[PDB]
């Protein structure tokens, strides 16, 4: 039997909002340690990895390992029925074919219970060796979102260049070209850039704009890059875990 009670339900609402636009279905691997979710989008251009530790929940119970196949589009729609101040509980039986979501309003006079069917999903393995990157940039999450949004008005792809001094994001299109340069500042609104060697990569803005849907989950975002390797964009979910996105570069 599975029981996960999250007092700050808005966290789950934000997670689904950050997932649904990128992937429509995924397997939520549940265990005594928490919730793990990993899935590539249909085009295999990006991969999302979610971690929600048991310690982050008010109450957490998962007698046995479970792999629940879930329609994220449907789950997000149901989470729309939860207030931002609702306590949210996810509940499932041992051999669950359904997932129950319970929302407790802050007024204590209203309690909602939603049940959605689970689905069989061919959860695919995806060996990704955690390594070190040539360049790691940490910046305000809102700042990164605004950069991706702005350049999207200019082009469909962004060239990210790293070197001594800062990081530059460049795009070009029919209306002209633009470059946004970020230089290290002197935790939330600061910019830190650790460079091992200059790196230049091109990425599709369409996917980056999907990643920034996770902005409300954290005040900061960290970008990790290395030549000819997937970009990694990470958002820490305050004392819960994190949401990591991987994106294959162009070429």
């Amino acid at each position: 039997m599975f029981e996960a009670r999250l007092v700050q339900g808005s966290i789950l609402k934000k997670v689904l909002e950050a997932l649904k636009d990128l992937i429509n279905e995924a397997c939520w691997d549940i265990s005594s340690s928490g919730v793990n979710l990993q899935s590539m989008d249909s085009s295999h251009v990006s991969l999302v990895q979610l971690t929600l530790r048991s310690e982050g929940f008010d109450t957490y119970r998962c007698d046995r390992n479970l792999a629940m196949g879930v329609n994220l589009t449907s789950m997000s729609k149901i989470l729309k029925c939860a207030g931002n101040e609702d306590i949210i509980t996810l509940r499932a039986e041992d051999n669950a074919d359904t997932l129950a979501l319970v929302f407790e309003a802050p007024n204590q006079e209203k309690v909602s219970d939603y049940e959605m069917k689970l689905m069989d999903l061919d959860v695919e393995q995806l060996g990704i060796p955690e390594q070190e990157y040539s360049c790691v940039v940490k910046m305000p999450s809102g700042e990164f979102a605004r950069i991706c949004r702005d350049l999207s008005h200019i082009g469909d792809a962004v060239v990210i260049s790293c070197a001594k001094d800062g990081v530059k994001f460049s795009a070009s299109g029919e209306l002209g070209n633009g470059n946004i340069k970020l230089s290290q500042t002197s935790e939330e609104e600061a910019v830190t850039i650790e460079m091992n060697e200059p790196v230049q990569l091109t990425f599709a803005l369409r996917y980056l704009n999907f990643f920034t849907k996770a902005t409300p989950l954290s005040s900061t975002v960290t970008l990790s890059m290395s030549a000819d390797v997937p970009l990694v964009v990470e958002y820490k979910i305050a004392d819960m875990g994190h949401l990591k996105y991987y994106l294959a570069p162009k070429i």
Binding site: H44, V45, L47, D122, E124, L126, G127, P230
Partner: peptide
Amino acid sequence: TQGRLDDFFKVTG
């Protein structure tokens, strides 16, 4: 051209 993560990672899922 846009690459896919399969060209960078081993899957077999």
